[PDB]
């Protein structure tokens, strides 16, 4: 079964950028719910229940027809949020090979940011915006609801290994920003954990 | 060109069920944006720019491939919210032919409410829950994002003439209910305008 991961910081550790109230609800209510629903669905599937969540979502097609959607939405939710919590932290700086790769594939850090913001802001409805590694090139993509690039293009409309991502579901920013998603996206740059992003980029898997 | 419709009541007229703050943001920010976005896309489409929004959404397949999605999302948003504002009012009572039809197709009003709540709560991500009329029979269905039964089954996955509907996008209930969508759905019963629902049921078109 999956365990709800604890956060690597206090609920107010991202202030004054991301509000403490949202961090707590987002983690203890929303993420908890996705974990519960995924675990409940996997109860009768011992074989799949043993796999790490990141691996399970790459095999949604091998699941019984009646368990595919619930796991896509909830296991996808668990995987995305787990990655999200670890990808946030104040005081980090983009540098090293990751910075070099971004300037290489996007021309500059500013161009990359503009592209990411465009994808995050244009996602209509609920979804996520991502910086992914496809083979050896970095790219920006967005997915609907709780889909992940790890699920494959056939299912999510995108592919690649997630380096970092931003939750653009309204519950992630409504309490503090209401309809102003663009403001939320801007504040994100102040809390994106570049150290974790660099680590994932190095691993590539 | 489309314009934001004025409300037939004040922003605090649905208290203590729907909060004044949300009513104001929902109308002046969200709905206004759908209207603005739809108008911007229609500027270069003289042939569709002057159709009533309810007519435009039944003809999405006739639109240029590059305009279809933007209008589906924004004209769909304009149509759904316009219907939503008119469908809310305190102090109404379910009765007459509408009540008889509900008891007929659902067994009882309580069974109907249970079915509606289930559909509204089960819609994952952003969407709408509807009570529609099809083949002289009432049915409950839900759609994703800003799709509408009026768009047809091929596009929205549902069909029928909408009698009433409930917005379950998180912006519709997050400020007051946060993650508790079920509580929001229950409060809805206190503000659903049965008089307007009865009128639409009588018209059937
Ligand atoms: Mn989320
Ligand atoms: Mn809405």
Curated annotation (Swiss-Prot), chains A, B:
Cofactor: Mn(2+)
Binding site for Mn(2+): 26, 81, 167, 171
InterPro entries membership: Mn/Fe_SOD, Mn/Fe_SOD_BS, Mn/Fe_SOD_C, Mn/Fe_SOD_N, Mn/Fe_SOD_N_sf, SOD_C_sf
Catalysed reaction, written as an equation: 2 superoxide + 2 H(+) = H2O2 + O2
Note on cofactor: Binds 1 Mn(2+) ion per subunit.
EC top class, as a word: oxidoreductase
Record keywords: Manganese, Metal-binding, Oxidoreductase
GO MF, any single term: superoxide dismutase activity
GO terms classed as biological process: cellular response to selenium ion; removal of superoxide radicals; response to acidic pH; response to heat; response to oxidative stress; superoxide metabolic process
This protein's GO CC annotations: cytoplasm; cytosol
Function: Destroys superoxide anion radicals which are normally produced within the cells and which are toxic to biological systems.
Protein name per the record: Superoxide dismutase [Mn]
